[PDB]
Amino acid sequence: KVFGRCELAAAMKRHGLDNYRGYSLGNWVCAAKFESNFNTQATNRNTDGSTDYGILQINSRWWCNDGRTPGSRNLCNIPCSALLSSDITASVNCAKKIVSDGNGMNAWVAWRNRCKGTDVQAWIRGCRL
Numbered sequence: 143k144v145f146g147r148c149e150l151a152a153a154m155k156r157h158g159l160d161n162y163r164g165y166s167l168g169n170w171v172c173a174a175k176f177e178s179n180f181n182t183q184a185t186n187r188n189t190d191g192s193t194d195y196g197i198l199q200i201n202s203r204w205w206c207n208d209g210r211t212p213g214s215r216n217l218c219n220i221p222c223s224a225l226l227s228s229d230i231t232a233s234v235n236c237a238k239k240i241v242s243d244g245n246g247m248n249a250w251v252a253w254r255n256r257c258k259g260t261d262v263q264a265w266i267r268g269c270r271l
């Protein structure tokens with residue numbers, strides 16, 4: 143499913159991401175935009191053999207099981223395919239674990255390089271949240 147900007151904003155808010163660990167909703171929408179272009183089915187293979195899944199491009203090396211990333215952890219306790227669903231719940235719940243992991247949202251390269259320090263409020267402007 144390819145979410146609309148405000149549709150995703152509302153879904154993320156409903157799932158408790160607004161200000162989760164101090165990160166305003168605009169941060170989450172911006173990260174999703176640049177990680178997956180709001181597409182829940184996005185996947186990208188990394189050089190180490192791991193793969194990123196879903197709207198938040200969660201990595202199989204640590205957070206989910208895809209059965210093809212040797213010696214990886216499954217810290218979110220879910221098959222990576224769960225992260226591609228039209229229902230963002232699994233992605234959000236896992237993201238909460240990631241963001242609490244100590245490095246905050248810096249865990250998402252696109253957020254660090256494209257959202258961090260920018261006017262992220264712009265990502266929710268105009269939405270009825």
Ligand SMILES: [Cl-]
Nearest residue numbers: 163245246247
């Ligand atoms: Cl933080």
Ligand code: NA
Nearest residue numbers: 202206214215
């Ligand atoms: Na894994």
